[PDB]
């Protein structure tokens, strides 16, 4: 062992340029959708608030994680206090918790009209958006309690490490960490990607069983596929931890180095997912293309 990763400077350089580019692209991307969805009155349909909520979630997504992930490349001190030390993990979980279900919610509503012979803020939609914005906080409040600041001297240093406390405090939080990797996988990948693939295919089957129908089928299939491969590296990194991590073998120096490589590239690409939907709507929707 010669340090966990001794942060290769090149790795910090590529992240900083690529995360900043995603940040500005993300900032203008979703904010333009928010401006259009608010300045104009005609664009206030049922799906529009659902789309705006996803953009609103994508707004809050890149605002929190990006500045503090790229900071740790420069230095790791967490100079934000213990009170906020629990605020980022709670909020950033809620930051993407709204977005992950918004894609599911958008798939739910899109299948409705495709399978319906009639069409034209609905009461059901208003309840639907309200439910997600609170169920995300409720399902992310376990992250609020459990994170703490711990002092640790590595060959002599005033290092204030941050992680989920092994004491677990309440016995319920003990179950949380044991299935933390799997609960994140189940409720961000297993449940969401299943319904958004079964229902969208059902919409595609009903719509087809024609150039516009075929073209619109590809863009939604691309959108779900690009979503799956964007959040996979960040979730896969924790998957490798819970599966093949072992203390007997003296390979932890390389194992943690490899996973830390996958952690930062995944989260940076995950942030790119937050910004590809607003650019996706630009290239598929004529109502937004001429409203730019």
């Amino acid at each position: 062992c010669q340090g966990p990763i001794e942060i290769k400077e090149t790795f910090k350089y590529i992240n900083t340029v690529v995360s900043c580019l995603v940040f500005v692209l993300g900032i203008i991307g979703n904010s333009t959708l928010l401006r259009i969805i608010y300045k104009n009155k005609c664009m206030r349909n049922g799906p529009n608030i659902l789309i705006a909520s996803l953009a609103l979630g994508d707004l809050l997504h890149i605002v929190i994680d990006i500045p503090i992930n790229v900071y740790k490349l420069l230095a790791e001190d967490w100079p934000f206090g213990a009170e906020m030390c629990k605020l980022v993990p709670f909020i950033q979980k809620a930051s993407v918790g709204i977005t992950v279900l918004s894609l599911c919610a958008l798939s739910i509503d899109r299948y409705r009209a495709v399978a319906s012979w009639s069409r034209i803020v609905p009461k059901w939609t208003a309840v639907e958006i309200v439910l997600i914005w609170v169920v995300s906080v409720v399902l992310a409040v376990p992250e609020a309690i459990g994170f703490d600041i711990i002092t640790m001297d590595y060959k002599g240093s005033y290092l204030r490490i941050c992680l989920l406390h092994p004491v677990q405090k309440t016995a319920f939080m003990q179950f949380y960490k044991t299935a933390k990797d799997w609960w994140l996988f189940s409720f961000y990948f297993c449940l969401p990607l299943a319904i958004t693939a079964f229902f969208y295919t059902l919409m595609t089957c009903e719509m087809l069983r024609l150039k516009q129908r075929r073209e619109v089928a590809k863009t939604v299939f691309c959108l779900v596929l690009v979503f799956a491969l964007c959040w996979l590296p960040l979730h896969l990194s924790r998957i490798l931890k819970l599966t093949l991590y072992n203390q007997n073998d003296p390979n932890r120096c390389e194992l943690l180095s490899f996973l830390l490589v996958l952690d930062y590239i995944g989260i940076n690409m995950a942030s790119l997912n937050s910004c590809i939907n607003p650019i996706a709507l630009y290239l598929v929707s004529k109502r937004f293309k001429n409203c730019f």
Binding site: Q92, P166, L260
Partner: peptide
């Protein structure tokens, strides 16, 4: 992230350099 409650120097250092999730 920490698999145990021991010193876990490598694990705690990794989670101190790990992304915030």
């Amino acid at each position: 992230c920490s698999c145990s409650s021991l010193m876990d120097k490598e694990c705690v250092y990794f989670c101190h350099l790990d992304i915030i999730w």
